[PDB]
Design a protein around this ligand. Structure first.
Ligand SMILES: [Mn+2]
Ligand SMILES: [Mn+2]
Length: 194
Protein backbone atom coordinates (compact mmCIF):
# COMPACT_ATOMS: atom_id res chain seq x y z
CA UNK A 1 0.00 0.00 0.00
CA UNK A 2 2.74 2.58 0.91
CA UNK A 3 4.85 2.00 -2.19
CA UNK A 4 1.70 2.56 -4.29
CA UNK A 5 0.96 5.68 -2.32
CA UNK A 6 4.46 7.13 -2.91
CA UNK A 7 4.42 6.41 -6.63
CA UNK A 8 0.95 7.96 -7.06
CA UNK A 9 1.48 11.00 -4.83
CA UNK A 10 5.03 12.26 -5.48
CA UNK A 11 6.19 13.59 -8.83
CA UNK A 12 8.10 11.17 -11.03
CA UNK A 13 11.53 12.85 -10.75
CA UNK A 14 11.28 12.89 -6.94
CA UNK A 15 10.46 9.18 -6.96
CA UNK A 16 13.37 8.47 -9.34
CA UNK A 17 15.84 10.36 -7.12
CA UNK A 18 14.53 8.54 -4.03
CA UNK A 19 14.73 5.05 -5.65
CA UNK A 20 18.23 5.87 -6.85
CA UNK A 21 19.15 6.88 -3.26
CA UNK A 22 17.75 3.61 -1.85
CA UNK A 23 19.47 1.42 -4.44
CA UNK A 24 22.79 3.09 -3.65
CA UNK A 25 22.95 3.12 0.18
CA UNK A 26 21.57 -0.44 0.31
CA UNK A 27 17.98 -0.01 1.47
CA UNK A 28 15.30 -2.33 0.05
CA UNK A 29 12.19 -0.21 -0.66
CA UNK A 30 10.01 -3.33 -0.43
CA UNK A 31 11.16 -3.63 3.23
CA UNK A 32 11.79 -0.03 4.22
CA UNK A 33 8.64 1.36 2.57
CA UNK A 34 8.14 4.12 5.19
CA UNK A 35 11.73 5.34 4.65
CA UNK A 36 11.00 5.48 0.88
CA UNK A 37 8.13 7.92 1.64
CA UNK A 38 10.40 9.88 4.01
CA UNK A 39 13.17 10.25 1.38
CA UNK A 40 10.60 11.49 -1.14
CA UNK A 41 9.32 13.99 1.37
CA UNK A 42 12.77 15.24 2.34
CA UNK A 43 13.76 15.75 -1.31
CA UNK A 44 10.53 17.58 -2.16
CA UNK A 45 10.88 19.96 0.85
CA UNK A 46 14.51 20.77 -0.12
CA UNK A 47 13.59 21.42 -3.77
CA UNK A 48 10.67 23.59 -2.73
CA UNK A 49 12.84 25.54 -0.20
CA UNK A 50 15.49 26.26 -2.91
CA UNK A 51 12.77 27.22 -5.44
CA UNK A 52 14.63 24.96 -7.87
CA UNK A 53 13.02 24.61 -11.34
CA UNK A 54 13.38 21.18 -13.00
CA UNK A 55 12.21 22.61 -16.37
CA UNK A 56 14.44 25.18 -18.02
CA UNK A 57 13.34 28.40 -19.73
CA UNK A 58 13.53 26.72 -23.13
CA UNK A 59 10.90 24.19 -21.98
CA UNK A 60 13.04 21.10 -21.27
CA UNK A 61 13.59 19.01 -18.21
CA UNK A 62 17.09 19.39 -16.69
CA UNK A 63 17.36 16.69 -13.93
CA UNK A 64 20.82 15.97 -15.30
CA UNK A 65 22.09 19.27 -13.81
CA UNK A 66 21.97 17.84 -10.28
CA UNK A 67 24.80 15.44 -11.07
CA UNK A 68 26.35 17.45 -13.94
CA UNK A 69 25.66 21.15 -13.35
CA UNK A 70 26.47 24.21 -15.43
CA UNK A 71 27.02 27.52 -13.60
CA UNK A 72 26.55 27.91 -9.82
CA UNK A 73 22.61 31.68 -10.67
CA UNK A 74 19.98 32.05 -7.89
CA UNK A 75 19.61 32.86 -4.17
CA UNK A 76 19.75 29.19 -3.13
CA UNK A 77 22.12 26.58 -4.39
CA UNK A 78 20.90 22.99 -3.99
CA UNK A 79 23.26 20.50 -2.48
CA UNK A 80 20.79 17.70 -1.53
CA UNK A 81 19.63 15.50 -4.42
CA UNK A 82 23.01 15.37 -6.12
CA UNK A 83 25.55 12.61 -6.31
CA UNK A 84 27.71 12.96 -3.15
CA UNK A 85 30.98 13.56 -4.99
CA UNK A 86 29.31 16.31 -7.00
CA UNK A 87 27.64 17.77 -3.85
CA UNK A 88 31.11 18.15 -2.24
CA UNK A 89 32.46 19.72 -5.49
CA UNK A 90 29.63 22.30 -5.29
CA UNK A 91 30.26 22.96 -1.57
CA UNK A 92 33.99 23.47 -2.32
CA UNK A 93 33.39 25.85 -5.24
CA UNK A 94 30.99 27.81 -3.05
CA UNK A 95 33.50 28.11 -0.19
CA UNK A 96 36.24 29.08 -2.69
CA UNK A 97 34.06 31.80 -4.24
CA UNK A 98 32.28 33.19 -1.17
CA UNK A 99 34.91 32.45 1.49
CA UNK A 100 32.13 30.72 3.46
CA UNK A 101 33.29 28.14 6.04
CA UNK A 102 33.55 24.58 4.69
CA UNK A 103 31.15 22.39 6.67
CA UNK A 104 32.19 19.04 8.22
CA UNK A 105 28.83 17.54 7.20
CA UNK A 106 27.16 17.67 3.78
CA UNK A 107 24.37 20.26 4.08
CA UNK A 108 21.18 20.55 2.01
CA UNK A 109 21.40 24.11 0.56
CA UNK A 110 23.63 27.16 0.34
CA UNK A 111 22.06 30.56 0.95
CA UNK A 112 24.06 33.25 -0.92
CA UNK A 113 21.99 35.95 0.77
CA UNK A 114 22.70 34.96 4.40
CA UNK A 115 26.04 33.39 3.39
CA UNK A 116 25.44 30.15 5.15
CA UNK A 117 24.71 26.60 4.47
CA UNK A 118 21.33 25.30 5.56
CA UNK A 119 20.52 21.87 7.02
CA UNK A 120 16.92 20.78 6.44
CA UNK A 121 14.99 18.09 8.31
CA UNK A 122 11.37 16.82 8.29
CA UNK A 123 9.78 15.03 11.26
CA UNK A 124 6.51 13.30 12.23
CA UNK A 125 7.33 13.90 15.93
CA UNK A 126 7.65 17.04 18.11
CA UNK A 127 9.98 19.38 16.16
CA UNK A 128 12.52 20.02 18.96
CA UNK A 129 13.52 16.33 19.20
CA UNK A 130 14.92 16.13 15.64
CA UNK A 131 16.21 19.70 15.85
CA UNK A 132 18.33 18.76 18.90
CA UNK A 133 19.39 15.44 17.40
CA UNK A 134 20.76 17.40 14.41
CA UNK A 135 22.09 20.37 16.42
CA UNK A 136 24.10 18.30 18.94
CA UNK A 137 26.22 17.00 16.05
CA UNK A 138 26.10 20.05 13.72
CA UNK A 139 28.14 22.90 15.26
CA UNK A 140 28.51 26.02 13.08
CA UNK A 141 25.36 25.77 9.23
CA UNK A 142 21.77 26.88 9.89
CA UNK A 143 19.12 24.25 10.88
CA UNK A 144 15.46 24.39 9.81
CA UNK A 145 13.10 21.59 10.82
CA UNK A 146 9.53 21.10 9.58
CA UNK A 147 6.89 18.75 11.13
CA UNK A 148 3.89 17.31 9.23
CA UNK A 149 1.50 19.22 11.54
CA UNK A 150 2.94 22.62 10.66
CA UNK A 151 5.40 23.44 13.39
CA UNK A 152 8.93 24.57 12.61
CA UNK A 153 12.10 25.12 14.54
CA UNK A 154 15.13 26.99 13.20
CA UNK A 155 18.44 28.27 14.41
CA UNK A 156 18.04 31.62 16.21
CA UNK A 157 14.30 31.56 15.31
CA UNK A 158 15.45 32.72 11.86
CA UNK A 159 13.28 30.91 9.35
CA UNK A 160 15.19 32.25 6.30
CA UNK A 161 12.21 32.23 3.89
CA UNK A 162 9.20 34.45 3.89
CA UNK A 163 5.92 33.46 5.50
CA UNK A 164 4.33 32.57 2.16
CA UNK A 165 7.04 30.16 0.92
CA UNK A 166 7.10 28.52 4.36
CA UNK A 167 3.31 28.11 4.17
CA UNK A 168 3.68 26.33 0.79
CA UNK A 169 5.92 23.67 2.38
CA UNK A 170 3.59 23.31 5.36
CA UNK A 171 0.61 22.91 3.04
CA UNK A 172 2.26 20.18 1.04
CA UNK A 173 3.21 18.29 4.27
CA UNK A 174 -0.42 18.56 5.54
CA UNK A 175 -1.67 17.16 2.23
CA UNK A 176 0.76 14.19 2.38
CA UNK A 177 -0.25 13.37 5.97
CA UNK A 178 -3.94 13.71 5.12
CA UNK A 179 -3.75 11.38 2.10
CA UNK A 180 -1.70 8.82 4.06
CA UNK A 181 -4.38 8.88 6.81
CA UNK A 182 -7.10 8.39 4.19
CA UNK A 183 -5.33 5.21 3.04
CA UNK A 184 -4.64 4.00 6.61
CA UNK A 185 -0.87 4.56 6.27
CA UNK A 186 -0.18 7.51 8.61
CA UNK A 187 -0.03 5.68 12.00
CA UNK A 188 2.64 3.22 10.75
CA UNK A 189 4.56 6.07 9.06
CA UNK A 190 4.49 8.12 12.28
CA UNK A 191 5.40 5.20 14.56
CA UNK A 192 8.34 4.09 12.39
CA UNK A 193 10.29 7.33 13.13
CA UNK A 194 11.16 6.11 16.68
MN1 LIG B 1 21.04 16.32 3.31
MN1 LIG C 1 18.92 17.54 5.52
Amino acid sequence: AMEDFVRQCFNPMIVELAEKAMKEYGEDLKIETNKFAAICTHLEVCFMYSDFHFINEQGESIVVELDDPNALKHRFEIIEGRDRTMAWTVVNSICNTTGAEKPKFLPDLYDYKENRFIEIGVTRREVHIYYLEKANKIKSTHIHIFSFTGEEMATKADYTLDEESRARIKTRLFTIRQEMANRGLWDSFRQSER
